[PDB]
Amino acid sequence: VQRIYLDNNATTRIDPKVKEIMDPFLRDHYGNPSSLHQFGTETHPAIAEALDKLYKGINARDIDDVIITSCATESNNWVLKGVYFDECLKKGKNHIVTTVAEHPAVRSTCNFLESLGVEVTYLPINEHGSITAEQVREAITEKTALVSVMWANNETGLIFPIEEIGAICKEKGVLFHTDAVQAIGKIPVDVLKANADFLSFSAHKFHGPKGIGGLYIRSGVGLTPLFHGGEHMNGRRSGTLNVPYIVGMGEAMKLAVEHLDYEKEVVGKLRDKLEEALLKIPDVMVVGDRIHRVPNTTLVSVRGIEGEAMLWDLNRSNIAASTGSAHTAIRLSLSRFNTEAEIDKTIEVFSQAAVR
Amino acid sequence: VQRIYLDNNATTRIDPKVKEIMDPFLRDHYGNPSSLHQFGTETHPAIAEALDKLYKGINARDIDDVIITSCATESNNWVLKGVYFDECLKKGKNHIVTTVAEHPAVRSTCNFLESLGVEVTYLPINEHGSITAEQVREAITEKTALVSVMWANNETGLIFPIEEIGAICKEKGVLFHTDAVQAIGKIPVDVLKANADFLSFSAHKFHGPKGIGGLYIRSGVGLTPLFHGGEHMNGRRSGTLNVPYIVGMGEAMKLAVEHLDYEKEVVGKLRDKLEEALLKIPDVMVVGDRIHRVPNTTLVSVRGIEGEAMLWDLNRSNIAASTGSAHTAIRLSLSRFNTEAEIDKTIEVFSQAAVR
Ligand SMILES: Cc1ncc(COP(=O)(O)O)c(/C=N/[C@H](C(=O)O)C(C)(C)S)c1O
Ligand SMILES: Cc1ncc(COP(=O)(O)O)c(/C=N/[C@H](C(=O)O)C(C)(C)S)c1O
Ligand SMILES: [Cl-]
Ligand SMILES: [Cl-]
């Protein structure tokens, strides 16, 4: 069998250099970074270079934290539950603004915050398929604790106006969090440009293992731990370090940014080649704006064919894709690993499956 | 160089069968278990057998959860913060009882719960080096939400009276949590015998990777998520599955129990061989009871030599050990991998370092 992988917004294959760089921490360099003996101290240099690559990747500065969590889900839960006690209960600012595009755990966590009496404004998504920065302006009551807006949407591919929201946030003096999880590797990420207080990512969406992610925290800005115990990550997230994954995510991050041009030049081009052809066949439209999108994603609907049905069929010809809602549409999410071969084939296999 | 590893209460070497069983999930079986296509569905059987081994290892029953977390630290934070909203705020039972032996994150989390007005009784540790079940009895105000007692202590090796506390808890109708993290692999664990509502473990203390652990939850008993998003682990802990680690921890668990006799027969014997000799040289006593201890741990003090100083020196001769308080003492924590060779050598190297 020869399968075609087109589900990268949902997870990605660990890069071989990533797989390789981790291996020695699964073999012989197994000690606890916290221990003082040689087995501990050995791990130090490689953790440090890993972390370096992480800050380097998002343009964090030496005085900021990028804390290693066990996934973006953890990161996001930690921001929202954190600013709840720090700013909603204690500073009394009982409002958080966010969007409806936000992945479940963000929405879901907010939901639970309402259950404890938080006022949460869930910004509606427009016909262009986006949010506009001006919308965010409109919703910041000065008793607002936090704005949270995803950097790009995992369905549409659609990049939101993050740098602008950073401004609005700076100006209005409110805390800014962006879930960047579908931006890393797809387009450049600059926390500095973003006036982000808080930024989230998950390793597995840029060719690292599943089971690790990060939260960037701006220097000075504070966030009551979601994992108390305070023994690791300057006390901000206790619990023993996942050395292998950290070292991996480091490399993953590094490589992800190095391929940033290739993502735009080649992967985006492969996305347009796929999207062109598909769009040509009868009553098949792309959901949302086609202009401000991460390079690798396209979300198509075929009038009359349920998306769940299209996916089932595609699976049978060994092509892996997912569903985004619009009823439901097909989510085709490329990586640096797809070639034109696989694209051509996909267009063939799509079309034939369509008419049936 | 030929190094001797004696720090297993602080982390352990990933077993080669563990390392091996994971490898294909880092190579080619990389899909998201949640996806519906083949890349997702492939992972299913191996996750299932992994989970099987986990329940099998702690004697959980089909109707209980064993939820995959990203470490015991996560597990413990989740129990304590969970029962806080479920039983302290909502059912109004504003008391949690626990011990002073409990690892940091447990104590530390409780600490934060006091900051929100929880009444927490931190049971003192006796001269025998333990807790007595009767102590727990004494402290259960009927407005008590939870008792939390570690199964064995990570310093002394000392097993606490867990089955008895299970009784006391059942009788008094209060919620029971045991942090078992230093029991798995060292002695048999039975959640059933323990009338445990909640049980914690971390993979890396029994030859799995760091970065994964579990929380056992009894059927019916509920626990507001610490990771909202509700997409995974019957909604109880959202966030994408760390397939490799799960599959690994599975094997790790399996093997850990299979070696349970060998732990008692051989590793305990190696511990006594080491402990005997060390104890013989001038003014060196073992901290706490020597009788109800996990087989692999010994915690010695040498009057007049600081422990931190002994460790430094030992490190130089490529022997890795840690410190437990008593001022401070030496924590020597064996695994199934140590041989008599390494033990004899340790006694030599210890003694010589002592006189200096
Ligand atoms: C923007 C964004 N943020 C966080 C996540 C979750 O990553 P993780 O589950 O590994 O912590 C995701 C994962 N998204 C999956 C998807 O694209 O299908 C999910 C929405 C099912 S979690 C995401 O898209
Ligand atoms: C009983 C017990 N429970 C949980 C932990 C923490 O495991 P983890 O950091 O991997 O989540 C530990 C880890 N103990 C380390 C030790 O033995 O030195 C620690 C106390 C530094 S965290 C533990 O002993
Ligand atoms: Cl919290
Ligand atoms: Cl919570």
Swiss-Prot record, chains A, B:
Pathway the protein acts in: Cofactor biosynthesis; iron-sulfur cluster biosynthesis
Intracellular or extracellular location(s): Cytoplasm
Main subcellular location: cytoplasm
Cofactor: pyridoxal 5'-phosphate
Positions with a binding annotation for pyridoxal 5'-phosphate: 72-73, 154, 182, 202-204, 240
Modified residues (N6-(pyridoxal phosphate)lysine): 205
Keyword annotations of the record: 2Fe-2S, Cytoplasm, Iron, Iron-sulfur, Metal-binding, Pyridoxal phosphate, Transferase
Enzyme class: transferase
Function comment: Master enzyme that delivers sulfur to a number of partners involved in Fe-S cluster assembly, tRNA modification or cofactor biosynthesis. Catalyzes the removal of elemental sulfur atoms from cysteine to produce alanine. Functions as a sulfur delivery protein for Fe-S cluster synthesis onto IscU, an Fe-S scaffold assembly protein, as well as other S acceptor proteins.
Subunit (UniProt): Homodimer. Forms a heterotetramer with IscU, interacts with other sulfur acceptors.
Protein family per UniProt: Belongs to the class-V pyridoxal-phosphate-dependent aminotransferase family. NifS/IscS subfamily.
Protein name, as recorded: Cysteine desulfurase IscS
